[PDB]
Amino acid sequence: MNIFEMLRIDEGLRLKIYKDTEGYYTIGIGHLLTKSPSLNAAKSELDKAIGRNTNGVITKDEAEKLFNQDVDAAVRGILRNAKLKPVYDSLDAVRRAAFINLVFQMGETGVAGFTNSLRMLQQKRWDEAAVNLAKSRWYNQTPNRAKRVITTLRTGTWDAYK
Ligand SMILES: [Cl-]
Ligand SMILES: [Cl-]
Numbered sequence: 001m002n003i004f005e006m007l008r009i010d011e012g013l014r015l016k017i018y019k020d021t022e023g024y025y026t027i028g029i030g031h032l033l034t035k036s037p038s039l040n041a042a043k044s045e046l047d048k049a050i051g052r053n054t055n056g057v058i059t060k061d062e063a064e065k066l067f068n069q070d071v072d073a074a075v076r077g078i079l080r081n082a083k084l085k086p087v088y089d090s091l092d093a094v095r096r097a098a099f100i101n102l103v104f105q106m107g108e109t110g111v112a113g114f115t116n117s118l119r120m121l122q123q124k125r126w127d128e129a130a131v132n133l134a135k136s137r138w139y140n141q142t143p144n145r146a147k148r149v150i151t152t153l154r155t156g157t158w159d160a161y162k
Contacts, residue, residue, distance in 0.1 A: 001158040003071060003097045007104060009161060010145050013063060017042055017056040021142055028063030030104065031070060074100050077108040084112055087122050095121075098152040105145075106138065121153065130154040 011030030017039070020026045025033040025042035033045045043056050050062055078084040078099065088099055099121075103111050112118075114136070120129035130150045133139065139146040148160040 001097075001161055003100050004067070006097055006158075006161055007071065007101060008067075010101065010105075010148065013060075015058055015060065015063060017046065027058060027066070029067040029070075031063075031066045070104060071100070074104045078103055081108050081112055083118065084108065087118050090122050090124075092156055094156050094158060095153060098149050101149050101152075126154045126156075 008029055013029050014027065017025055017027050017033065020030075020032065024035050025039065025045075027033055027046060031049075033042045033049075036042070039056075043054070046056065046058070047054050049066065050058060078088050084099075084103070088096055091099060099111075102114075114133065117129050117132045120132060130153060133150050133153065134146070136146075139150070151160040152158065
């Protein structure tokens with residue numbers, strides 16, 4: 001198990017524009033297209049992202065390319081953010097994957113606001129951080145994905161994911 005397989009399990013793969021859990025136009029492996037309600041704003045964003053007229057549909061390759069970009073951007077965002085970086089540096093390899101997952105899903109900005117959890121993670125207070133992370137809209141809106149990430153953060157193993 002690695003960050004790529006972990007996220008591919010949590011987001012799935014869809015080759016056709018679809019709506020995410022929040023109602024946003026998305027494609028491939030959790031690649032958000034637009035928060036706008038228009039399906040044309042979404043196909044426009046898509047063609048821009050792919051470099052071709054897609055008519056809302058893409059190949060496996062295309063989806064994986066977007067995915068590679070997005071994990072990369074997630075990682076680079078963490079390393080650039082003054083609140084995230086120190087947490088990430090302090091963690092072990094499994095736990096780092098989970099932090100990435102948390103960022104991919106929710107933006108640097110959002111994760112960076114999880115102030116208290118961040119401080120607990122850094123102090124390696126696992127059980128307590130798990131308890132705090134669960135008191136969030138995040139957990140309440142996507143509880144099974146959330147529990148898997150939290151478990152990874154708590155344990156430091158890939159158990160939730162076998
Ligand atoms: Cl893009
Ligand atoms: Cl879920």
